[PDB]
Scaffold this active site. Structure first.
Site, PDB file in Angstrom:
ATOM      1  N   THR A   1       3.486  20.105  17.151  1.00 15.36           N
ATOM      2  CA  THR A   1       2.805  20.492  18.411  1.00 15.36           C
ATOM      3  C   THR A   1       1.422  20.935  18.306  1.00 15.36           C
ATOM      4  O   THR A   1       0.648  20.653  19.198  1.00 15.36           O
ATOM      5  CB  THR A   1       3.585  21.646  19.029  1.00 15.36           C
ATOM      6  OG1 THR A   1       4.963  21.225  19.096  1.00 15.36           O
ATOM      7  CG2 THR A   1       2.997  22.101  20.363  1.00 15.36           C
TER       8      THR A   1
ATOM      9  N   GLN B   1      10.993  18.151  14.085  1.00 16.27           N
ATOM     10  CA  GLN B   1      12.454  17.937  14.354  1.00 16.27           C
ATOM     11  C   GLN B   1      12.894  16.736  13.562  1.00 16.27           C
ATOM     12  O   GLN B   1      14.082  16.691  13.194  1.00 16.27           O
ATOM     13  CB  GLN B   1      12.809  17.722  15.840  1.00 16.27           C
ATOM     14  CG  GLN B   1      12.114  16.478  16.418  1.00 16.27           C
ATOM     15  CD  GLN B   1      10.820  16.828  17.107  1.00 16.27           C
ATOM     16  OE1 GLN B   1       9.925  17.546  16.613  1.00 16.27           O
ATOM     17  NE2 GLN B   1      10.724  16.358  18.331  1.00 16.27           N
TER      18      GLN B   1
ATOM     19  N   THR C   1       6.663  23.477  14.521  1.00 18.68           N
ATOM     20  CA  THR C   1       7.313  24.817  14.387  1.00 18.68           C
ATOM     21  C   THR C   1       8.804  24.711  14.131  1.00 18.68           C
ATOM     22  O   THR C   1       9.357  25.507  13.349  1.00 18.68           O
ATOM     23  CB  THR C   1       7.022  25.604  15.648  1.00 18.68           C
ATOM     24  OG1 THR C   1       7.407  24.775  16.753  1.00 18.68           O
ATOM     25  CG2 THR C   1       5.591  26.079  15.619  1.00 18.68           C
TER      26      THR C   1
END
Lengths: 326, 327, 326, 327
Positions: free
Chosen positions: B13, B60, B90
């Site tokens: 992100t 992810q 993150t």
């Protein structure tokens, strides 16, 4: 004095070690009779009647126990002024939420456990039980849903969870806070849960002897798709994802769950992260995949609500609306 | 006369964008490392920054191949720079941080950073996070602390750091043992360092490895299925980490499957789905009787990292329990 | 088995009420031998001796007891393998930091109390005391400064503070985390304080019979300058300001303190906010005014270090360097 | 088709700035409500915003006059708008919020907001904080919840909200009873509302009031001086709040000074320097015997707000205790 029924299920609160000095213990070996007159002071604040439902460690809690508890409570509601359920800590937060959705009695239902063995130095279970009985007895506790009372705090059944593997103070409502604090046998309530609970939910288990099959899969770096595939191959009704971050899926898990959802498996994105909502409108097009966002419900809480939603609908939009109301 | 800092970009992100500054919608591949670095011109007041794009993925989708590439690069390029900052998503930043913490042999600063808001969002956190990450990597006091994560003005050791909240900019915490330092006005007051062995003080060497042992994680809850645990055993997984209930307990059927797999040589680590606290020896589970290992404070995804690395060294559960007591 | 000396000072751990289930209690009338043989399991881990130093509630802790305790530990260091100090909770965080700065003994010094009186149901005091003796007996505990052991946790004397008025889990090291967790009589230490403590500090009270006078003023909207003025008129050696936000001062309090500092009163800016440093280089030019920034020391901790700093120097820059190193 | 939202500006770091984005130094309340608004163009997508400058001060200099001014203006202008945002310094936001929570008679949303980073700094929090505060003030569901604080994507009630950290963007928390809701993608899922009586459900009316009763705060600690307490008593303060040790306890000499003041008429509230939990009755202090009030979960700065307003109704200690049990 109000009549309070204690429904016992086992747990560390009924279980002991060889020693007070040592950490080792065996779970649910004491019966409710023995539990109650080890706290003679309950007689000062209630007329206590004990019933043993089961006697297991809560790490082996299951749907049959849940259905027995909910039906026993709903049937025996008019016989008593409140209930306290003695239970293992490990899965107290799941049973509490199950009962929070399926109990139609609006009298106090209070769950309680212990983080230390009843034989151990500074055993927490006696004073926890006493405060649970204070809460179940307090006329102000009614209409708040099913509660958990641990460490002088009244927690709502939906938000409450474990924060620490061993601490006596482990139970916290980590997203919205507690409902009240107990000091000197009195409670200053300042909150009540706005989600619909108990008599305000459609969920009715009075004639159910099993629940829809809902499993939980974990995400992490390099996650295997094999767990997800195993639940799909067994015909599971729904799968909850313990997502990384804001409910995100490892690519192999994403693929498997996208496929399952197409063929009518209900899929709920939750998170392995202990606090905060798995939101819509982030990285996953839930609309497009036919997934449901869990909101603040952690994986094991989202399993409870999904099993129950599936008793009413298989439709993902309707399940999403259930996850926005309950 | 400013330190040389390398940025290894992996995506995330921090490098990610949506169509409105005020809608939460976003995707992760959007900004290259050159563009990331040039958007924070204040970096050149503290360091001589060079940027290399290693991969460009949402974390992810982090994976063993990315870990191995990053450890070998940092180890190979140690001598060419004064410090490393890794930009990262993150979601799995805590796993990558611990993997690097056990396999990086460079004792120059390695600091990981990401962003909980996309680069396009109002009050985007990524710019100041990256700035503080470079502060951290340039501070000679950062050396010999292991691999670090820097987020929200805090320096976090790579072992204990984890997410506390799904969206909060303050989500990264060392939930069991606390942070190493706080950053104020581009300065760090360190009051802690991790006691567990890291970087050059581990035996873990991935320099010649092109894959890692297969370790899966299974969740416990009421009425849990043994099917996930059985699928991993049937696929020949080298190890399985249990995300247990309370102090690392297992649902009976999961317990039965993992006790059977341990008998046959599967490494089994009991951890906890509960976000803080040790999974301890000497509670309800006789680990020495079943061949099981207790994870201590390592949460399931951390326990996975150390078990994969333990299995490069040994298959003996007594030796793996010793690894879990030392790293 | 090691020799452990219990220096008793009173507190709730030695406190009692009229009922197991009423919150009312008093401190200061129960002797150390009562605590020691409420924990017979101590004999399994140590040869304990108890001495009663004082019998007070820690809300009445004072410079004289501090001076007594530091002297006695320093004097009796060779006679034992470790110390536990039983102490009230209310100011345990102050005494622990004083002793962290003034003890030169190289053996474990562990403080302990209780959040429930010894008469309550599920009293925390007995297992806290057992865990404090495990801690003092642990060779690994040496060289870590003065420790507080509460709720299965080993906390450093500098960072440790109360987080809650009543919770048994109140004691936390809110800025830097605990040193170790205790389970089954074993500690896994993963941290040690970086700040200089015990034999590495220049503070020596072996011959002091009093401490410089340092008071604390609170800041808030519309704050009266009358507290600060009353300390200035009384010739106080130092004033600690419990600041708003990052150590800020209400105009009237600031004016009184800027004046005091020009006459040679030492002024430390700390914060009423329970975590985070009061930093240099924010809204207050400390160099211009002669003020000192407390860092992560909270107001009562800042008073402890300011008193000791003033036993060596009155110089603002030197006091700041002490606040940067201890 | 958008709500009308009034921004009342008071100063605070959300308005003014440092020489630099790179450095921590700043001067408070130098920008007018007008800079503030134009600095966030997306407000026009969600509301019709009008700003008025009430005062322009750092909140460390907040005072009884600004409170009275704010409460009177909101009760006067309630009919003219659909809701209020108040820009305010962080340092005493939690005291102004409880004050307005007890005195505002307007049941339209009133939301306070600030910024923990200067307007000029990298990753400034002020813009998106203000967006979110306007989102909250515009949400019909925010009505009847009392006065709110909106910080770090969270909606907090005026009574429980407080600072947890000197510098973190996430410092504002309702530490005892939790937040009312979280903000994502400009929507709020409210799961709570405060049960303590507020706004139009209180007897507190400041409309004709040009000053408040004098209430000071004293700190307790080891060897506490009684000279602060003695000084407020000598000046004939209406009220004294004790920031007690532990569960609202007092150092002997402070206890004895306040016992003596209470017997002659001074209203005494035991609060606590400890950041969470209630100062209870029925602990070590016989409050009925000394004529003291237990503050409950109200911290000393909060207990001062409530005691001042209680003293505009009554001097009776059992009646003040009733107010401390109800608001």
């Amino acid at each position: 004095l109000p009549n309070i029924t204690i429904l016992a299920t086992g747990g560390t609160i009924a279980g002991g070690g060889d020693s007070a000095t040592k950490s080792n213990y065996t779970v649910g070996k004491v019966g409710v009779e023995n539990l109650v007159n080890a706290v003679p002071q309950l007689k000062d604040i209630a007329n206590v009647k004990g019933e043993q439902v089961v006697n297991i460690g809560s790490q082996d809690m299951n749907d049959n126990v849940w259905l027995t508890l909910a039906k026993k409570i709903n049937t025996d509601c008019d016989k008593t002024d409140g209930f306290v359920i003695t239970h293992g800590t490990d899965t107290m937060e799941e049973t509490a939420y199950f009962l929070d959705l399926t109990v139609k009695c609006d009298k106090p239902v209070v769950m309680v456990g212990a983080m230390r063995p009843s034989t151990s130095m500074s055993a927490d279970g006696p004073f926890n039980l006493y405060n649970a009985v204070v809460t179940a007895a307090d006329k102000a506790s009614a209409n708040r849903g099913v509660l958990v009372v641990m460490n002088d705090t009244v927690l709502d059944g939906r938000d409450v969870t474990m924060t620490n593997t061993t601490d006596v103070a482990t139970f916290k409502s980590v997203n919205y806070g507690p409902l009240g604090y107990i000091h000197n046998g009195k409670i200053d309530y300042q909150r009540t849960p706005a989600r619909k609970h108990t008599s305000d939910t459609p969920f009715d288990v009075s004639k159910l002897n099993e629940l829809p099959k809902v499993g939980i899969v974990y995400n992490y770096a390099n996650a295997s798709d094999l767990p997800a595939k195993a639940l799909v191959d067994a015909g599971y009704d729904g799968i909850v994802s313990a997502g990384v971050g804001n409910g995100n899926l490892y690519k192999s898990v994403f693929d498997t769950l996208a496929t399952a959802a197409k063929t009518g498996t209900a899929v709920v994105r939750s998170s392995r992260v202990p606090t905060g909502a798995t939101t819509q409108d982030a990285e996953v097009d839930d609309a497009k995949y036919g997934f449901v966002a869990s909101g603040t419900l952690n994986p094991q809480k989202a399993r409870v609500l999904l099993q129950l939603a599936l008793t009413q609908t298989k439709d993902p939009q309707q399940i999403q609306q259930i996850f926005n109301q309950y």
